Structures are given as C-alpha cells and as structure tokens.
Amino acid sequence: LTKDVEASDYAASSQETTGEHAPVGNAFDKNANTFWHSKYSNPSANLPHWLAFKASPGEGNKIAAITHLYRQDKLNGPAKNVAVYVVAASDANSVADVTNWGEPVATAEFPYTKELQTIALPNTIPSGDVYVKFQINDAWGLTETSAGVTWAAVAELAATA
C-alpha cells in the first residue's frame, strides 16, 4: 500500500567520483540533496545511462511502481525518455550478473521538471524479489527546446509495492 521497498545491490552504467562525489549509492540514500551522476570526467560515459538494484518487497507482494527524483538544485538536462526492465532476483547471483533484461516492462517520457516522477509497472512482472534496471535513453537540453545533454543525474530512485 503505496509504501517503499528495500533496495540493495546497486549498480550503474557509469558514475562520477573524480570531478565530484556522485556514486550510484547517492541515488538510494533517501536524501534529495545527493545524486548519482554519470561519469563526465574523461573518459566520459555516453547515453544510454542506467541504474539497477534489487527490490525486496516481502514474500506476498509485488512491486507496483518505480519513482524517480531528479537533482533539486538546478535544471541540468533531466531525463526525458526512460525505460524500466525487471527480472526475478533468481535470474542471477547479483544485479551485475544479469545478462538478459528482457523487453522494457514500462516506458515513460518525463516532463521538463525536478518533480518526482512515477512509473507504474504491469502486474505481469514477477512477484517478490526482483532486479530492476532504470535506463535513460534521452535527456532534456538546458532549455526544453535546446539539444539534449549527454549526461544523467538522479537524486533518488525507489520502488513501491
């Protein structure tokens, strides 16, 4: 019932730890002020960028939604076109082991905003413990109409059940 789910075993396509302290862990710490950021220091990562983690909802429940909160400080090309993949935690030893994520169970286009975004998931996803990949295919520019940025940042990523 609209409640948050234990996350663990965090992974990212890339992360910045040189130019600033922005590891994947920043996206799961329940602090709006901290964010994961893609590696932009040289050699910089490119799109798509993603975060993944394990969601543990309890035995008799299923994750209903992924939530995304951008950084809150400024508008710096927030995520635009996103995709969520899901597999059963049994599918591998850890998040990082997962070699096939299947078809996106959900997509979303986010408005030009810092506000919290919710992506409801289909009930065809496995029950109980799941690995989740949140992937950013496209980003906003520095205005709505300028060319999209090549980097990504997320202050918080979470699953509800």
Residues lying near Ca ion in the complex (CB under 5 A): 26, 29, 31, 34, 155
CB closer to Ca ion, 49 vs 98:
49
CB closer to Ca ion, 27 vs 87:
27
Q: How far is the CB of 155 from Ca ion (least distance, A)?
A: 5
Q: Please report, in angstroms and rounded to a whole number, the separation of the first and last CA atoms in the chain.
A: 6
CB closer to Ca ion, 34 vs 81:
34
- Euclidean distance between CA atoms 157 and 75, whole angstroms: 18
Residue nearest to Ca ion (CB): 34
- For residue 42, how many other CB atoms are within 10 A of its CB? 7
Buried b (16+ CB within 10 A) or exposed e, 54-74: bbbbeeeebbbbbebbbbeee
Contact 99, 138 (CB under 8 A): no
CB closer to Ca ion, 3 vs 21:
21
Q: How far is the CB of 92 from Ca ion (least distance, A)?
A: 26
Parallel, antiparallel or unpaired: strands 81-88 and 106-109: antiparallel
Q: How far is the CB of 30 from Ca ion (least distance, A)?
A: 7
Q: How far is the CB of 151 from Ca ion (least distance, A)?
A: 17
